[PDB]
Ligand binder design. Structure first.
Ligand SMILES: [Mg+2]
Ligand SMILES: [Zn+2]
Lengths: 22, 70, 166, 102, 53, 212, 55, 120, 101, 217, 102
């Protein structure tokens, strides 16, 4: 974290992992 | 039972040599107290055999002390 | 003085016949005569069979009864021992030779490990457990002096009296 | 169980001391229900007292109890036991608020 | 219900076999608001050895 | 899985919930105690099992002080249910340099101990002596010559009990320690501070009125 | 290097106390000097502040 | 530790979580931060108001030989709350003085002492 | 140290008499001639002083026996109220301060 | 902050609110460090108010092997004299090998502690009282529980030994009343078998109790 | 062991001078002094205060000396008492009557 992402603009929900499980 | 019995057994033998140790310390205290009645007070000791044997054992112990000293 | 003799065929043949069967009358096996190849081997062989020749405690307890009068006098003591405690100390499962190794060094007492050798009598001075519990014995003795005198009765009865009065 | 017990010397069995069982500290475990232990020795068992009182999963599975407000107030969080506190039904609430005439 | 204060009972376990006689020999009529009504041996169905084993 | 979930810790009392666990003893971090017995029991069965003497004794509110854990503040009242930091303090702060002047310990002697090297008595029997820390723990203590000055140590040996407040104040600076030393030797050797000891030179008239 | 210098100064101090070079009045330079007199020895003695708080 | 390295390890974000942290917080940093709720400034700390013969009975259960001046006001760290009239309610500072205020309103005579201001 | 006023109830340890001891305002060492080593440890000791004099050896003088000693024991006021309210009024005269009936 | 040369202690600060920027944060109850803060928002004030304590143990407490009673690995934010960079670093307690003669068991134990632990083990009355005073979760060190179990077992055998010698006292008091008179050589041995004591070992430690008192002299 | 260097040698030689002064003739004298003046105190003063303070001749000795603190060179609190009057702080650099800065 040389630079912090803007995390304050997201509501809290877990994204689906892109290598999605079958 | 296979687990528990070897335990109460050990407690039993522990109580046993507890009694044994009590008796032996009774022997020791008899030793110093009868010693105290014989040397400090007077007129009374046990048989000449007891006295002679006691003396012999004392001499042997003293020899062991002289040997273990060096 | 420090002479550790390593055996051979013939000197084993005569030394064992002279020493352990002549003096100690001890009986070797074939495996024995396989392993008797030092002076340390022969000495702890003889030592082992001699210490095995000595009576166990079961034989000593049946030559020495504890007489009813003695045990009765032991019964009339105000205190009898607790005597479960040995089962509380931690046992660890490891090699026996590493246990040999750690008190070969000073490593056995360090990391919370300690070795337990049951004692009989202790060091009484500067022993803080000893003192507190013999103080306790003193007040139990003066307590029974109070009981045999009868003030215990009076104290309890006046407790009941002041409970009834309130 | 065999610690700190007086011996009865006739039978050489343990004396069944009635005071033993009120001083005793019950140590939980899985393949036994609870194990009575003398109190002085209770202090080494402090961790599996905390594992028994713990919720029996990863806390991530039950974490939803934590985040919403209504489930903070209705659930017990002491040493990680997520378990419903006692909570009235609706008819109870109605008849509890009604007889106070409110 | 706080005006009722009915006959509380107390089960008192003495570690010896003489507890009853001792309890009467204490001679307690009142602990001073309570006025103990009666002392009697609570009869237990004797427990087997399996309970302390 | 857990057969027999253990009961709440301090729940001995009938109508009021137990103190929060971790205050009694256990894992810290919740401000309210809870027990399913005391909750599930109907209100009337709580009141039936009580009286207005007993109820007011366990309704009792000790405000900031906590009963079970003496001297500290009660955790529920603290903003974060974890215990107070300051009484639970570490000796050195983050920026605090470590300069701790050697401290010496009041110690009760168990035997008359004579120093051969210095030709003087280390200490007499039952006499409290301030000694070096390592000299105490490494030598006096492993032998039976001496033990610590704790008040219960005075209690056990049958001596009249006094408290030396050992390490009540631990000096983090050397001058702090000489302040500590000065008040200490004002307390323990107080015969130094009586006026006759100030006047050692005059137990008589002035020194110039004498003979040769 | 403060500790050993400290030691040095203490031994030095006791040496001058055996041999009578030690001036006990040095902290007192700014004060006027009391009466040197046959009863006034209560003045020259350095008083602890504590027993002055006591009486 | 990554919190030192400033990584945002929140579980909604990447699925990780900061390793040295408590898994339960009964009040998070925002509602710890609000000291207006916690401390008693401008806020009533006793929410029931007793009638006259209630107040008199409550005062009647105070043991004699008690001064108000023996109950120091707790610091800011300590939460301000009153458990109502419980046993030993006079040991509670805020309960003591709230009761004092009701006794001032209802015209009940105040048996205890009053708070002293010590000065140098 | 110290920014705020505080009241303590201390027991004289020799004779066991309870007297009260106060701590008043003394100013911060000057912010303009700045010393971090002064200010910061002053801060930590300030926090300490505020909590029951935890790490401080208390030194005062007994009124009932007039001498200066550090035997003092600092009591939180609930332990004080436990100590005081169980006393007969004639031993309040001996052990406690004037009045405090 | 007072500019006056002499400042006797006052009940309340006499000049009103103390002036200066540092006295602001002092009156707020914050540390003096706050005069160097650029971000003064709620979160930073909460952060440095110190109510939340941020620090950690090296291992989880169940797995903690050394006595860290209170020393949490802390962290410190410092600044170079090239002031444009600000770096923080972890700080650890000074853990010193405890070698303490344990009193109840006669022997030393080397169990690692911290400095605080040693000062406090001096304060407590010795290693054993220190280990027993703590309970449970208070000592997070496994080593601690091990030597604690040894200490308890050892204590109970101290009690056992005491009890033992008391038994001995009752025996010798009881039989001395019998053998206090001289009587006869034969009569004594009846008492020797009435209680069950062997005669020859009695002679032996009579001879050793002897050897013992003249040896010292 | 450099001797040809002046102040490196004669100063550590001054050190060994000082510390062979102590443990031979200095230390036994200091210890003997401390012993001798307590010995002076207890048969002259103490018999007065045992009568005065209301104790016995024995328990007054345990009260007036509660502990033995004998002074060895690595333990000493102060060499001499702190100054009675501390000199007065002038303004910054000899400004008069006052300075704006610090
Ligand atoms: Mg829900
Ligand atoms: Zn006093």
């Amino acid at each position: 974290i040389h630079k912090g992402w803007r995390t304050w603009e997201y509501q809290h929900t877990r994204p689906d992992p892109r290598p999605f499980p079958d | 039972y296979e687990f528990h019995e070897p335990l109460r057994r050990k407690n039993a033998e522990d109580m046993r040599q507890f009694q044994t140790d009590v008796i032996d310390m009774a022997c020791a205290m008899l030793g110093e107290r009868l010693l105290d009645t014989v040397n400090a007070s007077d007129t009374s000791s046990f048989p000449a055999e007891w006295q002679e044997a006691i003396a012999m054992h004392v001499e042997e112990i003293e020899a062991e002390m002289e040997e273990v000293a060096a | 003085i420090e002479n550790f003799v390593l055996e051979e065929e013939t000197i084993r043949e005569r030394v064992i016949y002279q020493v352990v069967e002549g003096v100690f009358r001890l009986s070797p096996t074939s495996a024995d005569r396989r392993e008797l190849r030092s002076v340390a081997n022969i000495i702890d062989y003889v030592l082992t069979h001699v210490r095995a020749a000595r009576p166990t405690d079961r034989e000593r307890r049946q030559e020495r009864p504890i007489t009813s009068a003695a045990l009765a006098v032991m019964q009339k003591c105000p205190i009898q021992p607790q005597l479960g405690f040995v089962h509380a100390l931690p046992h660890d499962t490891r090699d026996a030779l590493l246990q040999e190794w750690e008190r070969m060094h000073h490593l056995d007492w360090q990391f919370g490990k300690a070795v337990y050798t049951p004692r009989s009598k202790e060091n009484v001075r500067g022993n803080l457990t000893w003192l507190r519990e013999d103080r306790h014995y003193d007040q139990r003795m003066k307590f029974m002096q109070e009981v045999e005198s009868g003030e215990a009765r009076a104290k309890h009865m006046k407790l009941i009296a002041e409970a009834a009065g309130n | 169980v065999h610690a700190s017990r007086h011996m009865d010397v006739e039978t050489w069995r343990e004396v069944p001391d009635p005071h033993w069982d009120e001083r005793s500290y019950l140590v939980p475990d899985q393949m036994f229900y609870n194990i009575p232990v003398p109190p002085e020795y209770k202090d080494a068992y402090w961790w599996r007292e905390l594992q028994a009182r713990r919720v029996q999963c990863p806390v991530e599975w039950v974490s939803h109890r934590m985040y919403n407000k209504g489930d903070r107030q209705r659930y017990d969080f002491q040493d990680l036991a997520f378990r419903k506190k006692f909570e009235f039904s609706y008819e109870e609430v109605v008849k509890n608020a009604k007889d106070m005439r409110s | 219900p706080d005006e009722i204060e009915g006959p509380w009972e107390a089960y008192i376990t003495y570690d010896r076999e003489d507890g009853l006689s001792y309890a009467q020999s204490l001679g307690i009529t009142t602990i001073g608001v309570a006025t103990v009504l009666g002392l009697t041996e609570h009869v237990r169905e004797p427990q087997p050895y399996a309970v302390v084993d | 899985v857990a057969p027999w979930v253990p009961p709440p810790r301090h729940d001995i009392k009938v109508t009021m919930p137990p103190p929060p666990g971790g205050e009694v003893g256990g894992r810290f971090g919740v401000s309210q105690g809870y027990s399913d017995r005391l909750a599930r029991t109907p209100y009337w069965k709580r009141m039936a099992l009580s009286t207005y003497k007993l109820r007011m004794m366990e309704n009792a509110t000790r405000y900031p002080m906590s009963e079970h854990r003496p001297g500290e503040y009660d955790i529920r009242y603290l903003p974060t249910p974890y215990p107070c930091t300051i009484r639970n303090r570490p000796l050195l702060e983050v920026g605090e340099p470590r300069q701790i002047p050697s401290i010496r310990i009041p110690v009760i002697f168990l035997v008359n101990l004579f120093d051969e090297a210095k030709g003087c008595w280390f200490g007499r029997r039952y006499e409290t002596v301030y000694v070096e820390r390592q000299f105490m723990r490494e030598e006096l203590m492993p032998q039976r010559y001496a033990i610590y000055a704790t008040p219960e140590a005075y209690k056990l040996l049958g001596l009249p009990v006094v408290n030396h407040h050992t390490h009540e104040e631990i000096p983090k600076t050397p001058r702090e320690y000489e302040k500590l030393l000065e008040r200490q030797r004002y307390d323990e050797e107080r015969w130094k501070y009586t006026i006759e000891y100030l006047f050692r030179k005059y137990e008589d008239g002035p020194p110039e009125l004498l003979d040769r | 290097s403060e500790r050993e210098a400290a030691q040095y100064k203490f031994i030095r101090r006791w040496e001058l106390q055996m041999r009578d070079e030690w001036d006990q009045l040095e902290p007192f330079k700014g004060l006027p000097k009391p009466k040197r007199q046959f009863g006034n020895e209560a003045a020259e003695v350095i008083w602890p502040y504590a027993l002055l708080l006591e009486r | 530790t990554p919190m030192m390295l400033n990584i945002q390890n929140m579980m909604w974000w990447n699925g990780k979580r900061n390793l040295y942290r408590a898994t339960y917080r009964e009040k998070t940093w925002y509602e710890i931060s609000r000291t207006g709720a916690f401390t008693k400034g401008r806020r009533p700390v006793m929410r029931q108001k007793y009638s006259r013969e209630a107040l008199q009975a409550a005062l009647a259960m105070v043991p004699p030989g008690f001064e108000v001046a023996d109950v120091p006001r707790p610091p800011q760290r300590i939460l301000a709350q009153s458990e109502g009239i419980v046993g030993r309610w006079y040991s509670n500072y805020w309960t003591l003085h709230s009761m004092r205020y009701q006794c001032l309103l209802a015209g009940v005579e105040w048996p205890l002492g009053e708070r002293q201001r010590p000065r140098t | 140290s110290s920014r705020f006023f505080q009241k303590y109830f201390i027991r004289c340890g020799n004779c066991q008499t309870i007297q009260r001891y106060a701590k008043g305002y003394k100013p911060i060492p000057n912010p303009i001639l700045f010393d971090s080593d002064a200010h910061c440890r002053s801060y930590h000791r300030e926090r300490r002083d505020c909590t029951g004099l935890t790490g401080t050896l208390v030194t005062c003088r007994c009124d009932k026996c007039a001498r200066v000693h550090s035997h003092w024991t600092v009591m939180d006021f609930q332990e004080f109220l436990d100590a005081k309210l169980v006393m007969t009024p004639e031993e309040r005269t001996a052990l406690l301060w004037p009045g405090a009936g | 902050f007072s500019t006056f040369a002499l400042n006797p202690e006052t009940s309340v600060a006499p000049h009103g609110p103390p002036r200066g920027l540092v006295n602001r944060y002092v009156s707020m109850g914050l540390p003096p460090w706050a005069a160097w803060c650029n971000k003064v928002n709620r979160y930073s004030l909460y952060r440095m108010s110190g109510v939340t304590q941020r620090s950690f143990l090296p291992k989880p407490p169940q797995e903690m092997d050394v006595i860290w009673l209170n020393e949490r690995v802390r962290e410190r934010v410092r600044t170079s004299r090239q002031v444009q960079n600000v770096y923080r670093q972890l700080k650890y307690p000074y853990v010193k090998t405890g070698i303490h003669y344990s009193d109840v068991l006669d022997h030393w134990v080397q169990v690692p502690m911290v400095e605080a632990a040693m000062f406090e083990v001096e304060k407590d009355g010795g290693f054993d009282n220190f280990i027993l005073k703590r309970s449970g979760p208070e000592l997070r060190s496994t080593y601690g529980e091990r030597i604690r179990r040894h200490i308890l077992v050892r204590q109970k055998e101290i009690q056992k030994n005491f009890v033992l010698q008391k038994q001995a006292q009752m025996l010798v008091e009881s039989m001395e009343k019998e053998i206090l008179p001289m009587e006869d050589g034969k009569k004594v041995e009846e008492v020797l078998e009435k209680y069950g004591i062997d005669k020859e070992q009695l002679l032996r430690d009579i001879a050793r109790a002897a050897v013992a008192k003249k040896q010292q002299l | 062991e450099a001797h040809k260097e002046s102040e490196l040698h004669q100063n550590r030689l001054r050190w060994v001078e000082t510390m062979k002064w102590w443990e031979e003739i200095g230390e036994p004298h200091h210890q003997q002094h401390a012993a001798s003046e307590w010995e002076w105190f207890r048969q002259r003063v103490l018999p007065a205060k045992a009568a005065a303070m209301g104790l016995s001749e024995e328990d007054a000795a345990r009260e007036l000396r509660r502990a033995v603190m004998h002074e060895t060179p690595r333990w000493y609190s102060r060499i001499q008492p702190p100054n009675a009057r501390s000199e007065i702080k002038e303004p910054r650099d000899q400004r008069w009557p006052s300075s704006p800065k610090w």
